Amino acid sequence: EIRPTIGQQMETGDQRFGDLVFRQLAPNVWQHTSYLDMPGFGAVASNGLIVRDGGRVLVVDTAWTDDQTAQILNWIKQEINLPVALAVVTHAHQDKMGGMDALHAAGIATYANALSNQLAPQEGMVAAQHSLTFAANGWVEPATAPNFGPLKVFYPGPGHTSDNITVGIDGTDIAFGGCLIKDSKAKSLGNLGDADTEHYAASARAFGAAFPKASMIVMSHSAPDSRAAITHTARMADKLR
Numbered sequence: 213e214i215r216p217t218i219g220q221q222m223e224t225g226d227q228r229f230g231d232l233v234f235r236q237l238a239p240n241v242w243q244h245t246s247y248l249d250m251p252g253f254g255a256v257a258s259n260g261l262i263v264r265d266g267g268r269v270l271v272v273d274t275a276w277t278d279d280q281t282a283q284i285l286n287w288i289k290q291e292i293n294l295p296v297a298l299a300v301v302t303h304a305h306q307d308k309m310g311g312m313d314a315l316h317a318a319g320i321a322t323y324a325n326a327l328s329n330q331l332a333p334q335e336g337m338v339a340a341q342h343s344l345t346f347a348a349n350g351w352v353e354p355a356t357a358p359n360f361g362p363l364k365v366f367y368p369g370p371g372h373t374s375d376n377i378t379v380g381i382d383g384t385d386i387a388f389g390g391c392l393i394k395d396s397k398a399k400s401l402g403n404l405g406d407a408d409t410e411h412y413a414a415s416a417r418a419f420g421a422a423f424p425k426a427s428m429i430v431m432s433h434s435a436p437d438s439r440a441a442i443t444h445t446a447r448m449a450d451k452l453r
């Protein structure tokens with residue numbers, strides 16, 4: 213099996229499919245995990261979500277690469293056998309947006325923060341085809357997120373990057389923090405190279421306040437955790453100021 217250098221390991225409840233791992237989180241929600249092999253370091257796991265909404269599927273984040281993202285679509289075809297309506301990607305870095313071309317080739321409508329689309333070319337990424345915009349309190353402008361079903365998109369403020377967004381899954385107790393949120397036992401906040409160290413703590417807390425009843429917090433590089441992931445992330449971020 214795949215034993216990443218960074219990221220959660222495989223546990224009971226995980227399905228290996230090609231080069232990826234899938235884990236059911238709820239009747240209608242699965243976590244996708246893909247792995248970047250770094251020469252001399254090993255594999256770095258990155259997680260996103262797959263959500264069934266009636267007769268259609270919604271995706272949060274690509275895999276690291278186009279081929280891995282095509283494998284996600286193949287898993288969906290095999291295990292769910294319903295079309296992917298749209299994908300939302302949570303900022304312009306390779307773990308979240310590296311597979312855009314595979315989504316586009318498949319005819320899937322793609323959405324990202326307008327700022328992520330603006331940064332994408334600068335980051336070696338392909339922009340999403342549609343831009344999300346946000347209110348002053350972080351909630352997505354509904355006209356920019358048409359037919360999103362249970363996906364509730366929230367921009368918490370600058371943190372891991374200035375463009376990072378988060379997604380709650382309405383009708384569940386799950387919320388997705390992407391790379392903004394690290395697990396409750398993490399020793400670091402990960403890559404702070406593009407981070408806003410002044411605002412990170414407030415942004416992490418704003419994510420918590422946006423989804424105050426989410427009990428399962430999903431994130432990019434660890435297994436789903438309790439709300440202690442949010443509070444621990446914010447406490448680490450307090451030390452940056």
Ligand SMILES: CC1(C)S[C@H]([C@H](NC(=O)[C@H](N)c2ccccc2)C(=O)O)N[C@H]1C(=O)O
Pocket residue numbers: 248250256305306307308391392401402403404432433
């Ligand atoms: C896992 C990370 C340390 S790397 C990843 C991201 N970096 C990339 O996607 C880079 N393309 C990359 C370069 C070299 C090795 C691994 C990733 C970032 O800068 O936020 N997210 C970071 C994070 O979530 O803290």
Ligand SMILES: [O-]
Pocket residue numbers: 305306307308391
């Ligand atoms: O990232």
Ligand SMILES: [Zn+2]
Pocket residue numbers: 303304305372373391
């Ligand atoms: Zn990032």
Ligand SMILES: [Zn+2]
Pocket residue numbers: 307391432433
């Ligand atoms: Zn990351």
